[PDB]
Amino acid sequence: EAEKLLEEQRELMKQSRQEAQALIENARKLAEEQKEQIVASARAEAERVKETAKKE
After folding, report:
1. How far apart are alpha carbons 10 and 6 in whole angstroms?
2. What is the DSSP letter of 10?
3. What are the E-state strand segments in 1-56?
4. Segment (H or E) for 1
5. How far apart are CA 29 and CA 35, in angstroms?
6. How far is Cα 29 from Cα 26, in angstroms, rounded to an integer?
7. How big, in percent rounded to 5, are the helix, strand and coil portions of the chain?
8. What does the alpha-carbon distance between residue 49 and residue 56 come to, in Å, rounded to a whole number?
9. Rounded (5°) CA angle 41-45-48
10. How far apart are CA 16 and CA 5, in angstroms?
11. What is the rounded distance in angstroms from the CA atom of residue 55 to the CA atom of residue 11?
12. Is 20 helix (H, G, I), strand (E, B) or coil?
């Protein structure tokens, strides 16, 4: 029984490791998207400021 538990634990550990690598990869992707959005938002603000200055 102990030996079986060990095999399952090893398999479980492998699955967990795969998920973690996958989780990290997903986070990297999500983080890139947030940065892109913030950058886009910043660009928009700059554009608005420029337009405002011209109008003034």
Report:
1. 6
2. H
3. none
4. none
5. 10
6. 5
7. 95, 0, 5
8. 10
9. 140
10. 16
11. 66
12. helix
Resolution reading in Å: 3.0
Residue 53 is encoded by which pair of tokens?
């200055």
Tokens of 25: 């990869």
Query: Which residue has tokens 């060990």?
Result: 6
Place of tokens 């990290």: 24
CA separation for the pair 46, 38 (Å, rounded): 12
Q: Could you say which DSSP state residue 56 is in?
A: -
**Rounded CA gap, 27 and 43, in Å?**
24
Q: Which residues have a Cβ under 8 Å from the Cβ of 16 and sit 6 or more positions away?
A: none
**What kind of experiment solved this structure?**
cryo-EM
Amino acid letter for position 42: A
